[PDB]
Write a protein that binds this ligand. Structure first.
Ligand SMILES: [Mg+2]
Ligand SMILES: [Mg+2]
Ligand SMILES: [Mg+2]
Ligand SMILES: [Mg+2]
Lengths: 109, 109, 109, 109
């Protein structure tokens, strides 16, 4: 199918393998692709990325986030209705109340 | 699916299938033994046989599924039986009732 | 297929597709440029488009096919044109006639 | 499908991933599986292995040898009718006159 996402940087564009994408974030009306070594902008929506990203690795976990389960370090029940994801590079990502069942069902816990 | 999510004391930990050494039924619970950690999972060994890659994982005992890629050596320890030396030093049994299936699948005989 | 066999002065060298950076048509001959070496191949660029993985390789010029996994960054160098900075430091063109196809496939635009 | 070959050693059996098999040799009425770190015996014939080994990596190159093209370092035309394969660990493997066309056709040179 496809195996790289092209992030927009200030001067050029950087092809990043899917394997190096940690998460994607909808923020300030754009999609930010957060890769291990850089961050950049993409024109596709999170809805479009859900179609194109491999469903074995990537999961919509919040209206504003797609996470790569291979960069998840730990999953915490931060409150009674949500999760908080500890990423391998120290970042955190929320699983919202509205995605929390889908998230845990798909991940099998 | 790509990872298995192990239950921990404060949370859950996604582990790739490549890092799972073996799974053990114990006390009405499945224990997934990965390189860095062990945790529980809600699926039975029979459910995991369905969902784990058949090229890599094999039920070898009523209480164990082993990842063949973490078997260091296979030794006959009885008339009707094998014993698996794992990479990390541990040892997993192949019971009498699985020894024939086990060797047919791994192709020694 | 898994490897491409490059012709050398004393012989031939199998290179995995992962190690091919780009292929270049020159003088009635295809040059496969791998990380450690360059050699010739009897297949045309058109033949190689058929046989190389579409997720990884793309014809970007009448004289080049590039491996997207060895592109370091993509820069616009003209109205109708891109220039590819490769990992090893080299630079490959995307000609006017391929620039649109190139960006549609890589998903920037 | 399958992803390990079980070699017979003096005391036990050792599962080896296909990726670590360099070549197989029919010799003295047995099959010897030559892996990066050890050698051992298998009950299947070279004919049977041709069926079971991935055709993208493994090739029958001689009535007595199956080679893994991923462990080939260089291919030499040692005479006008044969090739000689330089393996990555320093060993050599012949491509006989009778397999030489099939070998070069499959490898594309
Ligand atoms: Mg992880
Ligand atoms: Mg082993
Ligand atoms: Mg790159
Ligand atoms: Mg090699």
């Amino acid at each position: 199918g496809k195996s790289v996402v092209t992030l927009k940087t200030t001067d050029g564009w950087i092809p990043v393998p899917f394997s190096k994408v940690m998460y994607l974030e909808a923020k300030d009306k754009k999609t930010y692709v957060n890769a291990e070594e850089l961050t950049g902008t993409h024109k596709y929506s999170l809805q479009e990325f859900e179609y194109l990203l491999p469903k074995d690795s990537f999961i919509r976990c919040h209206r504003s986030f797609i996470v790569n389960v291979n960069h998840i370090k730990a999953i915490y029940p931060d409150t009674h209705s949500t999760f908080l994801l500890s990423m391998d590079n120290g970042e955190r990502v929320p699983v919202s109340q509205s995605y929390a069942s889908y998230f845990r069902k798909l991940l099998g816990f």
